[PDB]
């Protein structure tokens, strides 16, 4: 896939990881 | 001037630069990180004994088509489970 | 039955020119392989590599055979020829012809003392072709040709007894390796050393002293 | 690889050049990169310059010209055949084509 969209997908997945970890801090 | 110091008193810079850059060499990195000691199933040894758990056939990769006859072995020294190929025509019948 | 078509060929068919060093002294171009055959009768060739190259066409590949030939007399003369032809045998025959046409002299020198005949090179030399650079270093009387078999064969046919070698780049490209080594071995008569500092008079060309024998 | 030594534009000794809109599609194109053509056309077509001169109330009245400078992006110009694909060696030629 396009590198720019691959980067966007990974950024959204890092964002999700951070939000998920914040629940239990 | 080739991008590296040449002064007669720049031995520290040359030695440190080489030391920083040898970490890009995976052989040196694996030797100093001790990955065989920490990560390798054998723990750095050449051989290792274990107990056969089950006999398993593994499909070969393309373009080959065959059933490579291996076993699942649990190592005595650390309890890790590995897959080991049984070489030659019909030596799987020797492994129980 | 060879009928020369060049002035040099006529002068060699007659006894006017008797050695290749007279050719080299005046840089005369050699275009007829019979000149080299007459002046260097004892030449040994070697097919160093045969390769198949393909040209894609509408119907399919068009394959031709490429031959690399090294010629030499083991006494200071060596040549190199590369030719493509439909057939291997014809490619080899024509590469032998142009290897003869390219035969150059080399300068043998001494590592250390000048006792006996020259056995090595007189100086360090280097040649480059493509990415391959071949360096030849003079070596003592014991060490043979310290080189890969490709460069070693060229050294043997050139008459070098003792030499160190070092190559860099994609040495597996045999044609480039041989061309680089051939350039290096030919640079021995291009490197000015102090024993060659003396001025020598410019002799008249043999095409000048024998103008009438080369006429027609 | 690099296709043009000028990178397809005309920016040397400069950092940034403000854009212009393609006449045909309104695409933002750098001013140095845009294909620019100056056209000076007669305002009345040669077929009608006669009947309009006969209908004119002025003896010796000169018909005005139409002055315009057109800016095209690379796609606009190639599509409209203002410029065409040239051979590798013919690309370097930057003199105006010898037609006029």
């Amino acid at each position: 896939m396009r590198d720019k969209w691959r980067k966007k997908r990974v950024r959204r997945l890092k964002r999700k990881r951070r939000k998920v970890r914040a629940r239990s801090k | 001037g080739k991008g590296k110091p040449r002064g007669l008193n720049s031995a520290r810079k040359l030695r440190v630069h080489r030391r920083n850059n040898r970490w890009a060499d995976q052989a040196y990195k694996a030797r100093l990180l001790g990955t065989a000691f920490k990560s390798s199933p054998f723990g750095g040894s050449s051989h290792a004994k274990g107990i056969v758990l089950e006999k398993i056939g593994i499909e070969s990769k393309q373009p080959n088509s065959a059933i490579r006859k291996c076993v699942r072995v649990q190592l005595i020294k650390n309890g890790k489970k590995v897959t080991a190929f049984v070489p030659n025509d019909g030596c799987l019948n020797f492994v129980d | 039955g060879w009928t020369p078509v060049t002035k040099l060929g006529r002068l060699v068919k007659a006894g006017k020119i008797t050695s290749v060093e007279q050719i080299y002294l005046h840089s005369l171009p050699v275009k007829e392989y019979q000149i080299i055959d007459l002046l260097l009768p004892d030449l040994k060739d070697d097919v160093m590599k045969i390769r198949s190259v393909q040209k894609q066409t509408r119907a399919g590949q068009r394959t031709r055979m490429k031959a690399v030939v090294v010629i030499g007399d083991s006494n200071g003369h060596v040549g190199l020829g590369i030719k493509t032809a439909k057939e291997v045998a014809s490619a080899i025959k024509a590469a032998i012809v142009i290897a003869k046409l390219s035969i150059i002299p080399i300068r043998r020198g001494y590592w250390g003392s000048n006792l006996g005949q020259p056995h090595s090179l007189p100086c360090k030399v280097t040649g480059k072709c493509g990415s391959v650079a071949v360096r030849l270093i003079p070596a003592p009387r014991g060490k043979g040709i310290v080189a890969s078999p490709v460069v070693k064969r060229l050294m043997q046919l050139a008459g070098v007894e003792d030499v160190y070698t070092s190559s860099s780049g994609s040495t597996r490209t045999t044609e480039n390796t041989l061309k680089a080594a051939f350039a290096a071995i030919g640079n021995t008569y291009s490197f000015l050393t102090p024993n060659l500092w003396a001025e020598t008079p410019l002799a008249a060309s043999p095409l000048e002293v024998y103008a009438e024998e080369a006429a027609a | 690889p690099k296709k043009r030594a000028s990178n397809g534009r005309n920016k040397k000794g400069r950092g940034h050049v403000k854009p212009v809109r393609c006449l045909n599609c309104a695409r933002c194109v750098p001013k140095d990169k845009a294909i620019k053509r100056v056209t000076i056309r007669n305002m009345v077509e040669a077929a009608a310059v006669r009947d309009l001169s006969e209908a004119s109330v002025y003896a010796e009245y000169a018909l005005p010209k139409l002055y315009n400078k057109l800016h095209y992006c690379v796609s606009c110009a190639i599509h409209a055949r203002i410029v065409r694909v040239r051979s590798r060696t013919d690309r370097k030629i930057r003199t105006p084509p010898q037609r006029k």
Partner: protein, 87 residues
Amino acid sequence: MENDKGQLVELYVPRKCSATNRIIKAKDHASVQISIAKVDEDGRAIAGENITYALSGYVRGRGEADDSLNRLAQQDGLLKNVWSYSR
């Protein structure tokens, strides 16, 4: 080049460029050897009696051959007030 016993083991002592002193190689086909006739007091060319110069292909490729001949011939008397040392 000679051995311990004195024999000239060198084959083919090569020529050198008159302008640059470079060795003229066996396959330097851009190199030339100019031969200029000697002229007797009657204005006649003396048969088989020449001033000879050699130029490497490097000098000829650079276009310096003409100016080098102007200098060499003026120093050898073949020319007068055509080449100037100071530019």
